[PDB]
Amino acid sequence: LVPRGSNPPPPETSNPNKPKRQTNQLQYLLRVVLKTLWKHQFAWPFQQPVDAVKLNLPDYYKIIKTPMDMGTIKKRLENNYYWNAQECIQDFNTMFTNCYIYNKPGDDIVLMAEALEKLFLQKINELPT
Numbered sequence: 001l002v003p004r005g006s007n008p009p010p011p012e013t014s015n016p017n018k019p020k021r022q023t024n025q026l027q028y029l030l031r032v033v034l035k036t037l038w039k040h041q042f043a044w045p046f047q048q049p050v051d052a053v054k055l056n057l058p059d060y061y062k063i064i065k066t067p068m069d070m071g072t073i074k075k076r077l078e079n080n081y082y083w084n085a086q087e088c089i090q091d092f093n094t095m096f097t098n099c100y101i102y103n104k105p106g107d108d109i110v111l112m113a114e115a116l117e118k119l120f121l122q123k124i125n126e127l128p129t
């Protein structure tokens, strides 16, 4: 009588068909950018996939078609899922914009996302060659 929602499987984090191509920029994204964002005071709501049921967001996956979270990004970096830094940056962008899409501009969670995004853009300015 009250819809409670339901969760998808989490996004894929490995691509076994792809060669292991390590780069300085991807190393930096894992060891500096991701780690720095992870430890920020506002990071915790973004560290794992949204649980629409336990968070009482029963329409979350109706609205958000491409979910993304920092735990998924961390695994993708660890597993060498990304071909380049741009792909990883795109996933951070998807994570922040999903928050802006689902929520209202004045919401606390949006202030948190904006702060993380500003820090992320600062850290991406410091990427290696």
Ligand SMILES: CCN1C(=O)c2cccc3c(S(=O)(=O)NCC4CCN(C(C)=O)CC4)ccc1c23
Pocket (backbone or CB within 6 Å): 045, 046, 050, 055, 057, 098, 099, 102, 103, 108, 109
């Ligand atoms: C980032 C994924 N995400 C959402 O988009 C979202 C919307 C509404 C609540 C919520 C939550 S939540 O844990 O239910 N509420 C987040 C609040 C919890 C209270 N706050 C703090 C700093 O202690 C502000 C952030 C987690 C992750 C979410 C959301």
